[PDB]
Amino acid sequence: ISVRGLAGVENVTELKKNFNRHLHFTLVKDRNVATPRDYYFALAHTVRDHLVGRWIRTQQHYYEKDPKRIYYLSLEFYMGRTLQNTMVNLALENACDEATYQLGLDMEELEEIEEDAGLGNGGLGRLAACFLDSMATLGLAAYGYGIRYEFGIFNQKICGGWQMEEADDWLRYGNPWEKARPEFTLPVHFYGRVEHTSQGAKWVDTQVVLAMPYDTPVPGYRNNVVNTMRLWSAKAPNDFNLKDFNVGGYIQAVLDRNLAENISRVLYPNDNFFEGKELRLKQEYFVVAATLQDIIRRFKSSKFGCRDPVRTNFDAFPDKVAIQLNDTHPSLAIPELMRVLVDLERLDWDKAWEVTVKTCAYTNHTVIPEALERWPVHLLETLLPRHLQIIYEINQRFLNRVAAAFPGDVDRLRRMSLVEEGAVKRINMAHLCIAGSHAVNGVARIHSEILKKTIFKDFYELEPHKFQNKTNGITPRRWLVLCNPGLAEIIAERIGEEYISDLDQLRKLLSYVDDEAFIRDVAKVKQENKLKFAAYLEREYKVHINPNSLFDVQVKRIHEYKRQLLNCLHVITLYNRIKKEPNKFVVPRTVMIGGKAAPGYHMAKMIIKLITAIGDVVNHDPVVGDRLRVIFLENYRVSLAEKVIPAADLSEQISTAGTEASGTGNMKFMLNGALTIGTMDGANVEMAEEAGEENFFIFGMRVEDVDRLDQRGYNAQEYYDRIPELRQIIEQLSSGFFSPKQPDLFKDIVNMLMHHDRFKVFADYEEYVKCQERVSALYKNPREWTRMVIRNIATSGKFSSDRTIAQYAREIWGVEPSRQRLPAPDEKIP
Amino acid sequence: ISVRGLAGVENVTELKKNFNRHLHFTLVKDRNVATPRDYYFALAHTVRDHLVGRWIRTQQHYYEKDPKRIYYLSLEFYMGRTLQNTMVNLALENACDEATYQLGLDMEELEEIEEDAGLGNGGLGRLAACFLDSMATLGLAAYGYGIRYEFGIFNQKICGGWQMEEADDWLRYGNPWEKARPEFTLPVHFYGRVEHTSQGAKWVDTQVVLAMPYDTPVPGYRNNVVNTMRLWSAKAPNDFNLKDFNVGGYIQAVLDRNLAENISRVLYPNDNFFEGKELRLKQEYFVVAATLQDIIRRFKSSKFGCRDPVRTNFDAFPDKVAIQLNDTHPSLAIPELMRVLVDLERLDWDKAWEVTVKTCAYTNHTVIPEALERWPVHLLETLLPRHLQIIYEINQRFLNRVAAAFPGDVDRLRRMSLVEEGAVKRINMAHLCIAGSHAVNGVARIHSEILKKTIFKDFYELEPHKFQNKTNGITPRRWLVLCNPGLAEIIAERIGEEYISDLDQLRKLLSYVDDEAFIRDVAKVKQENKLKFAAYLEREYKVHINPNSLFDVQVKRIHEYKRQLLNCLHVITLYNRIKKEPNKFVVPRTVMIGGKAAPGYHMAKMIIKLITAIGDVVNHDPVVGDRLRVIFLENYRVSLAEKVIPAADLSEQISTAGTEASGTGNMKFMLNGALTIGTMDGANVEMAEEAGEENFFIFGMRVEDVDRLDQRGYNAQEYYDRIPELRQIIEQLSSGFFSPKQPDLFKDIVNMLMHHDRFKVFADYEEYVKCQERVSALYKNPREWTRMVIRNIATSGKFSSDRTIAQYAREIWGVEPSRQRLPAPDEKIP
Ligand SMILES: O=c1[nH]cnc2c1ncn2[C@@H]1O[C@H](COP(=O)(O)O)[C@@H](O)[C@H]1O
Ligand SMILES: O=c1[nH]cnc2c1ncn2[C@@H]1O[C@H](COP(=O)(O)O)[C@@H](O)[C@H]1O
Numbered sequence A, B: 001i002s003v004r005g006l007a008g009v010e011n012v013t014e015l016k017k018n019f020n021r022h023l024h025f026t027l028v029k030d031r032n033v034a035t036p037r038d039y040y041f042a043l044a045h046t047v048r049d050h051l052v053g054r055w056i057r058t059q060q061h062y063y064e065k066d067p068k069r070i071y072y073l074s075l076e077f078y079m080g081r082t083l084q085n086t087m088v089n090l091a092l093e094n095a096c097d098e099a100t101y102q103l104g105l106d107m108e109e110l111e112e113i114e115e116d117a118g119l120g121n122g123g124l125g126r127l128a129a130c131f132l133d134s135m136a137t138l139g140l141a142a143y144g145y146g147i148r149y150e151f152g153i154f155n156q157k158i159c160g161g162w163q164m165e166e167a168d169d170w171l172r173y174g175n176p177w178e179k180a181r182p183e184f185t186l187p188v189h190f191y192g193r194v195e196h197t198s199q200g201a202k203w204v205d206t207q208v209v210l211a212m213p214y215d216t217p218v219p220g221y222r223n224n225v226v227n228t229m230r231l232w233s234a235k236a237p238n239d240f241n242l243k244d245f246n247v248g249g250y251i252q253a254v255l256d257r258n259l260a261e262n263i264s265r266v267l268y269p270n271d272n273f274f275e276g277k278e279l280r281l282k283q284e285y286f287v288v289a290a291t292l293q294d295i296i297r298r299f300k301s302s303k304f305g306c307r308d309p310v311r312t313n314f315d316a317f318p319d320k321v322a323i324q325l326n327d328t329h330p331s332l333a334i335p336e337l338m339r340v341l342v343d344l345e346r347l348d349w350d351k352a353w354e355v356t357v358k359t360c361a362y363t364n365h366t367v368i369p370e371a372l373e374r375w376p377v378h379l380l381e382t383l384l385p386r387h388l389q390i391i392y393e394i395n396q397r398f399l400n401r402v403a404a405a406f407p408g409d410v411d412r413l414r415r416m417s418l419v420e421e422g423a424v425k426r427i428n429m430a431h432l433c434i435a436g437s438h439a440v441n442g443v444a445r446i447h448s449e450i451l452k453k454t455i456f457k458d459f460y461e462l463e464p465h466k467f468q469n470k471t472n473g474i475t476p477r478r479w480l481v482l483c484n485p486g487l488a489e490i491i492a493e494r495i496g497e498e499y500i501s502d503l504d505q506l507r508k509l510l511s512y513v514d515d516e517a518f519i520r521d522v523a524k525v526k527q528e529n530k531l532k533f534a535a536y537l538e539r540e541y542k543v544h545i546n547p548n549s550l551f552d553v554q555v556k557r558i559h560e561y562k563r564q565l566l567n568c569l570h571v572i573t574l575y576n577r578i579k580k581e582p583n584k585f586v587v588p589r590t591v592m593i594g595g596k597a598a599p600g601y602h603m604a605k606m607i608i609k610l611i612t613a614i615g616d617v618v619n620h621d622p623v624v625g626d627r628l629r630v631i632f633l634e635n636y637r638v639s640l641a642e643k644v645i646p647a648a649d650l651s652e653q654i655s656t657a658g659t660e661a662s663g664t665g666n667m668k669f670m671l672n673g674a675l676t677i678g679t680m681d682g683a684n685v686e687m688a689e690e691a692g693e694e695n696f697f698i699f700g701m702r703v704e705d706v707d708r709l710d711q712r713g714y715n716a717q718e719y720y721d722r723i724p725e726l727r728q729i730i731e732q733l734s735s736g737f738f739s740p741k742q743p744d745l746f747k748d749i750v751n752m753l754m755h756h757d758r759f760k761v762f763a764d765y766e767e768y769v770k771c772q773e774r775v776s777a778l779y780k781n782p783r784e785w786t787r788m789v790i791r792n793i794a795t796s797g798k799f800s801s802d803r804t805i806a807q808y809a810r811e812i813w814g815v816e817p818s819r820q821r822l823p824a825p826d827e828k829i830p
């Protein structure tokens, strides 16, 4: 059937009876009233059963051996569905497929019932998920720590072409994967005040909110390692949230508990944008405070909680603990770690600081100013009074280090300050993370250089040893074996299966680049994938597309820097050229654009309306026929990504050079047989460098060209004046050609494009359409297109998150990866 | 070990492996980190497994045979713990005891870990629970319908002698018994307006809240019948509660969902008191609306949803459906049933009314005015506009019936109106229930007569056939076999086990009233029970009591009509007599008073403080020694009741004649070996009548004496003037003898007692202490006391809820009870 594992005789029979056990005892249903949802749950519980045994020994193991622990703190974990992925990592896919078949059910139909775990916005959240999978696969004693939002990223609905947001009630039917652990509930404090008494400061009169943990298993690829993802939930104490007496109402007091519990209610839907709301800061301290207590408790047991030097010596803390900060969201971990060590454990400042710097590491994800976290001091002052004091003290001693290094450089002092003066005083969380971490990394080579050359230049001059790079990656399990079994099978037919955990081996595929059978096969799976997607489209969304056309897809969050608008300009150009010479041949294309816009991002929402507006005109023009369709992919999310990427021919990674930190969608497309048209931005540079620029469609300004243009001054009128095709398009938008009933509907877009384009869309227009003509030319030559595809696939090995994690481990965490199978799952009950 | 069933070889081995399965696969723990709480859950899941098989066939059975369905609507279901009770009804107690023992665990220690299901206030809620158990045991196709409050009756804490309320987070650790059924979620409407168009009225522009059901199994006693208790939970729709667009905030919209969900958040802690709050009315319509849709859906399938006359003829609705209204809380079921039939199904008013009257029956629980539900019309007008219209129309046609029956009687017309004029117009929910039900019953013979003679006199004259009586009862399973196995065993040693489901057989115990061995045994279990309670006291609450003394206990909600104050007066009298003649012998007594006060009931909270105040003085008087202790039983609830009742010698049922509808605690004491000192109130009359007044300690005014006194006019000064002992006590309270630091602390109690005692405490004082002297005299004669006890126990059979349910069934519901074992639980998978 494929190498989805063995469909053993004993195991298929075992699966079936367990499926029935659960349907009866766990779901309390009888075959006669069972719906597909019940069947999905019976299977999920059956599958979950296979990894609890491994989960328990894995954790018991780490307790016995006591290795260095890796704690990955992130406010986002974009997980997606977990049934198939669990089957894949346990080599259960074929057995379950067989078993459910014999039970008279379609496994694929049941998989579609599982709700996505959308506790993420985009790139950053998905990175955390891929990292978790790789850390388990590389056998590291790692823990994912975050917030269990009861409402994830909103579900996007398109009404009259506009995006409508609706609550993502993903827990509505239950989550069979998590395990509530109410017995490890921890208290978290807010507000209060600071008392300075005799031997130390005291955080007093605080409001207590409880953090209840939920553990979800994270299985490594076929190695019997099951790590843990602990997600905290907010709970109100039953005392003060009722006991602070003297009138108000007993009923109201109980109803008011949903005020402390709102902390974990919903995920903020902002991607690369900072919103200084109090609820957000509360979520940030909430995940940090609870997680650190858990980390320290585990450390206090280790082997020190037995003997060792005997004396809770935190000198070995850094040798047993490593906490990675996914962006500055968990930045409070730095002053909080200081607070505990100093205020509670009573260590001296300098010893505490040495420990904190040695255990914390920070990862930066963007260079745009509006994405930077700068928290108003008055907020920190009211909510976390002692942390503000600690931050001021950290700033004081840091700046003294600067003044000592650069005597007299008074401007450098203010530039580097963690405290920003002005309208309102703010705290620069990034400056905080650089100062309190022993490593700061970028997510792609060029982004990492930009950090040293620009944004964190002063910091780099002060401590060059801190700055590193760790190019992002994706997990080949979910992003290849899971979403594209057809491609994984033919690759395996030639080079084996070892590449699933050693992607570098894909290079061996280079020797089949002239193999007639392989070229036929690679091309066949892509055709099969496109047919399946074209079908899903009519099934669930309804209104036909042509599977013979080129599948041009751009899927990612809607942003001005991602330039979906530049894509739009090209689509309209193709339309206008067809209307000019109708009977002239052009390569057919289905251009699919999908992504979510933050609810408050007006421009982004205006762009989604433009996309749909173009499709209204283009898709109903009889002269155009089937040569060009514009489709907007609704509710783009992880599970939808697993469907479109394997069916894409052209991947669009066209952000303005210097704005996209790295990107990971680009890597997903490269590994699944799509050719890339993009700018020399983020990881695009490394991809092109790996596959060879000849097998890549690069266009537009390089970072240097952008800077030259800024020195000069960007004037969009110039481009409007010298390019008639561009001019024609702008006058089409301005006159209501795409919005008949509301002729001035797109005035904000035109106005912006001409007068405030921060991302110079026009400057790359000519080179973009010129470059698009070249891919059309190559698509007309099936054999050469496919041969270039093989060149990309065969060279994508470097972009596996296993390579990324192995580097973090060695160069930052100080631990050695291991592909050693844990001693089976075998029963055992001590 | 006892007749807690057989500890079979095969079944004890089976239990143990299943215990381990769950501990591993379900709780995901390993023996090395398992705590008693985990062990309790492993057992609970194991026990729950044994009744799912039965649960599924029971429901499948009712679907096949299609009998008349009994729907018990109540806003309260005072369930308590369910582990032991499930073991008892499945004959699993000894097997589980053995199994856990072999596993090295104490079952009793694990049972104490289960949290109580306190979805009730007192008498009314507990009645519903006992009824459920009996309906299952009598094999009726009955369904309990209510609200799944996430916070039940508050946990009571005593601080400095005052009651402190604290949220009852009973779901904190999970509920292994319930089964969420998100697939049967139903919509409920609120607000909106009424449109009158061409062919009918339309309830329009409403706010939708979703009702999600949760099913808990209700097992009959050893008959393999497992009925269902469906509890609704409020959920916000993900559309409008987000989709009603045009600014406000995306985050706020999601956070605001906890406004529709507040409907099922907490139970109102009022016992026999009406609070006209909007949240309450919303809970009331919420349980009613969701339940009726469920009832009709089930009816639409039956055998009509196949053929029959063919034409949804609701003429047979009353022949297949019976809905019992537990008080007027679910009274909206009447106008709601009308709304559906008329507005949706389009039946004519008169046919709809005939159907509604024929399927609804109402049970009244009290005669005090402040406990009556009179909802302000402006509330109904805004929240349920169409129901108000229906109610007005019901009133119109009802009153026309009255005028036709009593021509010219204009005052009778206003007295009987469902609409009350005055300050604000209100709707009398009780008048509504009488008019729309074919049966109205009281809960005790005297209470039922009082309803006909007083409160509902006019209604009785109009339709005498509607008024019935159904004396309350308690379930002998939880209230005998579960809480007092020692007593159940010795009874069984003599007359067998058949009495557990046929309490009448306890009469055979009369022939052992002179049996020397039995008297020794009855007395022995009571001594064993008192010793165990005296121990629990020091274990969990700490500060000694004497097990040789008389256990004088009064446990029930704190009320002015229950007269805990009269008890207090007696306690202080005993104290003063001892201080007068210290070296004189008196029978030692431990008087225990327990119960909860509604948070807003100031007087009730003042009484709890008085009780504790008396204990502060009495319990520390060296001259008193061990002859008198005053203890306040903290957090009285179901599980605590199972502990005190079996250990009580004297039961206090001293409410003012005519105020206690029935009472059930009195029956629990009688069946467990306690003698009763009380007034001729509620069921006390029937109990005394059954055991013989010679074996009962009756005192005080009878209903007639109370009325005579009211004609005359109650003047407490008179009693204060002629009784020196009483006078001494009042001057003790007035001068701060019981409150040194705050001498005027109890001024409200004294003031009330002397000037506004609605329950004439003083009028019964003399006869109460006189009567108390008589029980002390009899307690001095162990053999005669025990012989009287045997006379009570042997005569308590009539107070089983099995007798009560059999009468409801035959005389109201029109169904025949059956003690037929359902065809085993045996596997099966169709
Ligand atoms: O005190 C202990 N004794 C024995 N095993 C322990 C102890 N603490 C942790 N463990 C084991 O380590 C796993 C890790 O627990 P955690 O990391 O503290 O959540 C547990 O599930 C146990 O198998
Ligand atoms: O349409 C039906 N076909 C077969 N069995 C049914 C059907 N509806 C109800 N049942 C059975 O009756 C039980 C009662 O369902 P309910 O009373 O509607 O909640 C179900 O769990 C099934 O065993």
Ligand SMILES: OC[C@H]1O[C@H](O)[C@H](O)[C@@H](O)[C@@H]1O
Pocket (backbone or CB within 6 Å): A122, A123, A124, A127, A272, A365, A366, A443, A472, A660, A661, A662, A663, A664, A682
């Ligand atoms: O680092 C993970 C991702 O974080 C953010 O979403 C960046 O915009 C993206 O470029 C990067 O790939």
Ligand SMILES: OC[C@H]1O[C@H](O)[C@H](O)[C@@H](O)[C@@H]1O
Pocket (backbone or CB within 6 Å): B122, B123, B124, B127, B272, B365, B366, B443, B472, B660, B661, B662, B663, B664, B682
């Ligand atoms: O009917 C059940 C119970 O309802 C109420 O709690 C009444 O006060 C009580 O007398 C009665 O026994």
Ligand SMILES: O=[P-]([O-])[O-]
Pocket (backbone or CB within 6 Å): A122, A123, A555, A556, A557, A662, A663, A664, A665, A666
């Ligand atoms: O993270 P990028 O692929 O939008």
Ligand SMILES: O=[P-]([O-])[O-]
Pocket (backbone or CB within 6 Å): B122, B123, B555, B556, B557, B662, B663, B664, B665, B666
């Ligand atoms: O219901 P009663 O025993 O307080």
